[PDB]
């Protein structure tokens, strides 16, 4: 229970601090790519959004480039609630226009082109490009260190209608904090469902996790140490280890860490009191996460945290057979003190 889990977490800490010069190298490579991209006309206002994608793989990094687009006209695609076309009312991005719709594909292509020419331009460190919508471009710094650069439109207008009932943090973080978060911009990233774009709130997880308690002083002193971050880390690591166990099969290909995050923040809404995440109760709180996740698999309901009407576990998205397979795997694990945490 709690002791075994804390040992898993200390192991993860020793793994992650594998000389964190990888962070400095990716910082440099990204600062160079941005330095070149801001020269081109189609990419004048590009920037960093603010970052690890895997806990078991401290060499796999993830970075997002924002590109502000004012006076943007969003058109929902076929009742999806999640995908949109980008339109306009001269234009800097006139190069990517196809009719009135803004082509993700043309945009991504000029992006990749600029980045390929500039990685060849750097004759100091070894950087290789691989092409496979999101992630947009994946790069390899010198060996084993991989960086996934994504491109996003940024809109500083109010969030689209589909998110109205979403971000249900009022009982936990507060109504005040929900309102101030919704005043932050929102993002769009290429993703096929068609030149459809998809809503993106990757900047909100950081905001919530850095200020995560109902008490403003949570995790700021000895008496108020909670285990929320640790439970999220263990849920990410649980899914990652199961996916590694079946990497040669497709059984789990359709589950991702964002299913884990969605379920975790639902449990945070369910369990708003800091008293329900006491550090001492790690084993219990984690069990709370697992059970909830299991319940979502069995009921085939996992609402997206921002667009509640979009079901991430809909039968039209993930197979019932995959959902039962992961159900059985997770249940075995919880019944056996999670041996998968051991490689």
Ligand X SMILES: Cn1ccc(-c2ccc(Cl)c(CNc3nc4[nH]c(Cc5ccccc5)cc(=O)n4n3)c2)n1
How many other CB atoms are found less than 10 A from the CB of residue 18? Answer: 11
Q: What is the DSSP string of 245-291?
A: HTTTSSTTTT--HHHHHHHHHHHHHH---GGGSBGGGHHHHHHHHHH
Among 33, 107, 119, 199, binds ligand X (CB under 6 A): 199
Query: Interface with ligand X includes 307 (CB under 6 A)?
Result: yes
Q: What are phi and psi of 173, to 5 degrees?
A: -90, -55
Q: Breaks in the chain, named by the residue before each, with C–N above 2.5 Å?
A: 50, 89, 132, 193
Query: Interface with Zn ion includes 226 (CB under 5 A)?
Result: yes
Residue 268 binding target from ligand X, Zn ion, none, CB below 5 to 8 Å by type: none
Task: Provide the token pair at 118.
Answer: 């500039």
To Zn ion, the closest distance from the beta carbon of 268 in angstroms equals 11
To Zn ion, the closest distance from the beta carbon of 229 in angstroms equals 7
- Whether residue 226 is annotated as binding a ligand: the answer is yes
- Whether residue 174 is annotated as binding a ligand: the answer is no
Residue from 205, 210, 187, 212 nearest 48 by CA: 187
Residue 305 binding target from ligand X, Zn ion, none, CB below 5 to 8 Å by type: ligand X
To ligand X, the closest distance from the beta carbon of 239 in angstroms equals 13
| Cα gap 60→47, rounded to integer Å | 21
Using CB under 6 A, which residues numbered 62 to 121 contact ligand X?
82
Pick 304 or 329: Cβ nearer ligand X = 304
Spell out a b/e string for 206-232, using b for 16 or more CB atoms within 10 Å of the CB, else e.
Answer: ebbeeebbbeeebbeeeeeebbbebbb
To ligand X, the closest distance from the beta carbon of 61 in angstroms equals 16
Among 51, 148, 205, 278, binds ligand X (CB under 6 A): 205
Among 146, 150, 155, 200, binds ligand X (CB under 6 A): 200
Pick 111 or 306: Cβ nearer ligand X = 306
Contacts of residue 190, defined as CB under 8 A and 6 or more positions apart, other chains included, come to 104, 105, 107, 108, 133, 134, 136, 151, 197, 198
Count of residues binding ligand X (CB under 6 A)? 17
Among 304, 318, 323, 338, binds ligand X (CB under 6 A): 304
| Cα gap 71→85, rounded to integer Å | 14
Query: Interface with ligand X includes 305 (CB under 6 A)?
Result: yes
To Zn ion, the closest distance from the beta carbon of 303 in angstroms equals 25
Among 86, 152, 173, 204, binds ligand X (CB under 6 A): 204
Pick 61 or 201: Cβ nearer ligand X = 201
Residue from 147, 144, 206 nearest 18 by CA: 144
Half-sphere exposure of residue 266: CA atoms within 13 angstroms, side-chain side: 22
| Cα gap 185→299, rounded to integer Å | 33
Q: Specify the 3-state DSSP secondary structure of 2.
A: helix
Using CB under 6 A, which residues numbered 230 to 269 contact ligand X?
258, 261-262, 265
- Whether residue 259 is annotated as binding a ligand: the answer is yes
To ligand X, the closest distance from the beta carbon of 100 in angstroms equals 24
Residues that bind ligand X (CB under 6 A): 82, 198-202, 204-205, 258, 261-262, 265, 304-307, 310
List the binding residues for 2',3'-cGAMP: 62, 148, 191, 198
Q: Which residues are annotated as a binding site for GTP?
A: 148, 198-205
């Amino acid at each position: 229970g709690a002791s075994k889990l804390r040992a898993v977490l200390e192991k993860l800490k020793l793994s992650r601090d594998d000389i964190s010069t990888a962070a400095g190298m990716v910082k440099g490579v990204v600062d160079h790519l941005l330095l070149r991209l801001k020269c081109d006309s189609a990419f004048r206002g590009v920037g960093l959004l603010n970052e690890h994608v895997k806990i078991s793989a401290p060499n796999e990094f993830d970075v997002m480039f924002k590109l502000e687009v004012p006076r943007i006209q969003l058109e929902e695609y076929s009742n999806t609630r999640a995908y949109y076309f980008v339109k306009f009312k001269e234009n800097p991005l006139s190069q990517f226009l196809e009719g009135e719709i803004l082509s993700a594909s043309k945009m991504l292509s000029k992006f990749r082109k600029i980045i390929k020419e500039e990685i060849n331009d750097i004759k100091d460190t070894d950087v290789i490009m691989k092409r496979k919508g999101s992630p947009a471009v994946t790069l390899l710094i010198s060996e084993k260190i991989s960086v996934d650069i994504t491109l996003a439109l940024e809109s500083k207008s109010s969030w689209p209608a589909s998110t109205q009932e979403g971000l249900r943090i009022q009982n936990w973080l507060s109504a005040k904090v929900r309102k101030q978060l919704r005043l932050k911009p929102f993002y769009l990233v290429p993703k096929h469902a068609e030149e459809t774009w998809r809503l993106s709130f990757s900047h909100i997880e950081k905001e919530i996790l850095n200020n995560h308690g109902k008490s403003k002083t949570c995790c700021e002193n000895k008496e108020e140490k909670c285990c929320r971050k640790d439970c999220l880390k263990l849920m990410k690591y649980l899914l990652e280890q199961l996916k590694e166990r079946f990497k040669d099969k497709k059984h789990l290909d359709k589950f991702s860490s964002y299913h884990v995050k969605t379920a975790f923040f639902h449990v945070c809404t369910q369990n708003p009191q800091d008293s329900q995440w006491d550090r001492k109760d790690l084993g219990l709180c984690f069990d709370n996460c697992v059970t909830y996740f299991l319940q979502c698999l069995r009921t085939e309901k996992l609402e997206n945290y921002f667009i509640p009407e979009f079901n991430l576990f809909s039968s039209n998205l993930i197979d019932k057979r995959s959902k039962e397979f992961l159900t059985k795997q997770i249940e075995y694990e919880r019944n056996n003190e999670f041996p998968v945490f051991d490689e």
